[PDB]
Amino acid sequence: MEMEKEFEQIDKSGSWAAIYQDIRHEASDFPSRVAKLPKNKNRNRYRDVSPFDHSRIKLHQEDNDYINASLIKMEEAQRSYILTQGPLPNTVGHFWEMVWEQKSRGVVMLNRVMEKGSLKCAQYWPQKEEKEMIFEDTNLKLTLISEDIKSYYTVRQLELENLTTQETREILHFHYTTWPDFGVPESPASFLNFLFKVRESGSLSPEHGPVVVHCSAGIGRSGTFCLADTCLLLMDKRKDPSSVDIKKVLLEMRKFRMGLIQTADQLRFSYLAVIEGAKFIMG
Numbered sequence: 001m002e003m004e005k006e007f008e009q010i011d012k013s014g015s016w017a018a019i020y021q022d023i024r025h026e027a028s029d030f031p032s033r034v035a036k037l038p039k040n041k042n043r044n045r046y047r048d049v050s051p052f053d054h055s056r057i058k059l060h061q062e063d064n065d066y067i068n069a070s071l072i073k074m075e076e077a078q079r080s081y082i083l084t085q086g087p088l089p090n091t092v093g094h095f096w097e098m099v100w101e102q103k104s105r106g107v108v109m110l111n112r113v114m115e116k117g118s119l120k121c122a123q124y125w126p127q128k129e130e131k132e133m134i135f136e137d138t139n140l141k142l143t144l145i146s147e148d149i150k151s152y153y154t155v156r157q158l159e160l161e162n163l164t165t166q167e168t169r170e171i172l173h174f175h176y177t178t179w180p181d182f183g184v185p186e187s188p189a190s191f192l193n194f195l196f197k198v199r200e201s202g203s204l205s206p207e208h209g210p211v212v213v214h215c216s217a218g219i220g221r222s223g224t225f226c227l228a229d230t231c232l233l234l235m236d237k238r239k240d241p242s243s244v245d246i247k248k249v250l251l252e253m254r255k256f257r258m259g260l261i262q263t264a265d266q267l268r269f270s271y272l273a274v275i276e277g278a279k280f281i282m283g
C-alpha cells in the first residue's frame with residue numbers, strides 16, 4: 001500500500017502495536033559473540049543492545065578492537081551510517097578513535113546528557129574554547145572552535161588532532177536538544193529541519209566517511225533518523241515514489257543492527273516524518 005493512506009488505515013484501526021510486533025517477529029537474528037566476551041562488559045551500556053559480529057566497527061588496535069557500534073550500509077539509497085551508543089566514561093577515547101579512523105565529518109547526537117534525572121551518556125566534548133580535552137588512551141586532542149545555539153538544536157565546530165601524527169580535522173557536532181523525556185515529538189517539523197541541516201553540511205555525503213549517530217542505546221531515536229533519511233532519498237531516486245515501503249526499509253536496516261525503532265510510537269513518528277518530508281522536498 002502507499003504510505004499516507006496505510007497510515008490513516010492504521011490510525012483508524014488502532015493497530016500500531018500489532019504492526020510493530022510483526023516487525024519484531026520478522027527481524028534478523030545474527031550472532032554478537034564479540035560484544036558478549038567478559039573483557040568487554042564495561043564497553044556496553046545495556047546488556048540487551050549489542051552489535052552483530054558481521055557489521056560491527058573495529059577499532060584499529062591490536063589489544064582490544066571492540067566498540068558498541070554498527071555500519072548500516074544502504075545499497076539502493078547509496079548511504080552509509082554508523083549507529084552507536086552514547087559514550088561511557090571508559091569509552092570516550094574509543095569513540096573519538098572511531099570518528100578519526102572512519103574519516104567521519106559529522107557526529108549526530110539525539111539525546112541530552114541528563115534525562116529523567118539520570119545520566120544518558122558521558123560529557124564527551126569540551127564546553128569552553130580554552131578548556132580542551134585530551135584522551136590519553138587513544139592519543140587524541142579535541143578543541144571547541146565555535147558553537148551556534150538555536151531553539152531546537154545546537155551546531156558545534158570541533159577540531160580533532162591525532163597527537164601521534166599532528167594531523168588535524170574539522171568535525172561538525174549536530175545536537176538535537178528538544179526530544180521529550182517521554183514519548184515522541186507531537187510534530188516532525190523540527191526533526192525534519194534538523195535532518196536537512198545535517199544534509200546541507202556535507203556530513204552525509206560520499207566524499208566523507210559515514211556519519212556517526214547516537215542516542216543513549218543507539219537504536220531508537222537513532223533508528224528514526226536514518227530510516228527517515230533513507231526513505232526520503234529513495235522517494236527522490238525512484239520513478240514511482242509510492243513504491244517506497246517503510247517497513248521493508250526498516251527490516252533491511254535491522255540486518256545490520258538489532259532493535260532499530262524501539263516502540264510503536266517511534267514507528268508512527270517515522271511514518272509521519274517521511275510523509276511530511278515528502279511534501280516539502282517538492283512541491
Ligand SMILES: O=C1CCCc2nc3c(cc21)C(=O)CCC3
Binds near residue numbers: 276278279281
Ligand atoms: O528535499 C529537500 C531539498 C531542499 C531542502 C529541504 N528542506 C526541507 C525539507 C526538504 C528539503 C523538508 O522536508 C522539511 C524541512 C526543510
